[PDB]
């Protein structure tokens, strides 16, 4: 029998994506956010709904670019904080000791230390509030990809957003192949 | 140290949802979608990214209405037959065994058999193209409820898509806390 929990943003799973970026300064920052995914594959793109009242959001507006970086659960903590905490007048690299790498592609700093990293173009601000950023590169730490070149996500170890009971998950084993199974 | 994989639609998680609709004629139907998530708190509202040539677009445009059935493990084969095989002369709930059950607040089917069935309402067509819901109402399987009644992860058991290698993992062990973990 299912029971109803009402209107709730409610779903599984959610991502922890750190958004980086610099200011007019040049001072990086991250955020973290979960209201986020991949909306396109021409060009590549993802969606991520940045409310305005945060620090990232007026970043985003004058620079047009911004990272996201995928914590392994080692950084779970320091996500959190980038959550919690602004940017405003805070430098949350210096904070978190975490490395704010400049991007290769794009004018904004991804988190060194973490296993993942896009980098993004600014191409679409829709105003329900989100920033669509065109992909121009995903790095991977050599140490989590397979013999194809494509990533291994139990290495990686990202993290997962539980909403509402708020909770962080790794991810676990391997089910099944996509595009194959339901055959 | 990173190597780069060039512009891919490469994140993690991303999830697997089953977007449920009714066609014309009252035919229930179900798709996979993992260009989606959570885009805003007021109204709570999930995005999912629909290309025109599914069947699941033009029920979505003609009703307003639709479900997300998120898959237990045990679901997996039948969620990737939903998103590779289309509902456009074929009843995939026949085919796969499963129940469409009518929502209780919108004009679309759920699975049954899922854990988890999320109801919306169509708001906003935006158009990149997007289809934004309105979350009218998310349902879980009692026996996912923790005391406090909201849901247990591992016991909705939720898959999670990994694209480009096109595999399928679920979810692994409790972290941490969100909102405390890093203070
Ligand atoms: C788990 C989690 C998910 C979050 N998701 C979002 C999100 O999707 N969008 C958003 O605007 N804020 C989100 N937040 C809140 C911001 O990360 C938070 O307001 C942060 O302090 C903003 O930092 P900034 O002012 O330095 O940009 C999230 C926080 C946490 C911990
Ligand atoms: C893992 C996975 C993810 C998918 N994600 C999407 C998506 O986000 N959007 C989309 O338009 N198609 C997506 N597809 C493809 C559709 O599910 C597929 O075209 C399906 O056959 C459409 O069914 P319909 O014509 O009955 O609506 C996905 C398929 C799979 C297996
Ligand atoms: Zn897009
Ligand atoms: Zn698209
Ligand atoms: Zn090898
Ligand atoms: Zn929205
Ligand atoms: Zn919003
Ligand atoms: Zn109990």
Redesign the interface.
């Known amino acids: 029998?299912?029971?109803?929990?009402?209107?709730?943003?409610?779903?599984?799973?959610?991502?922890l994506?750190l958004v980086g970026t610099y200011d007019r300064d040049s001072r990086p920052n991250i955020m973290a956010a979960?209201?986020?995914?991949?909306?396109?594959?021409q060009?590549?793109?993802?969606?991520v709904?940045l409310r305005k009242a945060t620090y990232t959001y007026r970043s985003i507006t004058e620079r047009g670019a911004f990272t996201?970086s995928?914590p392994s659960?080692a950084y779970?903590?320091?996500?959190?904080?980038?959550?919690?905490?602004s940017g405003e007048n805070e430098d949350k690299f210096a904070s978190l000791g975490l490395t704010p790498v400049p991007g290769?592609h794009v004018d904004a700093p991804y988190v060194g230390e973490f296993p993942?990293?896009?980098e993004l173009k600014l191409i679409?601000q829709?105003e329900?509030?989100?920033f669509?950023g065109?992909?121009?590169?995903?790095?991977?730490?050599?140490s989590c990809?397979?013999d194809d070149?494509?990533?291994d996500?139990?290495k990686?170890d990202?993290?997962?957003?539980?909403?509402?009971?708020?909770?962080?998950?790794?991810?676990?084993?391997?089910?099944?192949?996509?595009?194959?199974?339901?055959?």
């Open positions: 029998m299912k029971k109803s929990l009402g209107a709730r943003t409610l779903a599984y799973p959610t991502p994506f979960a209201w986020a995914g991949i909306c396109c594959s060009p590549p793109s993802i969606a709904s996201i995928i659960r779970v903590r320091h996500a959190d904080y980038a959550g919690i905490y290769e993942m990293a896009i679409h829709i329900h509030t989100q669509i065109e992909i121009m590169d995903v790095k991977v730490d050599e990809l397979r070149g494509l990533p996500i139990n990686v990202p993290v997962i957003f539980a909403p509402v009971s708020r909770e962080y998950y790794a991810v676990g084993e391997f089910l099944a192949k996509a595009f194959s199974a339901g055959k």
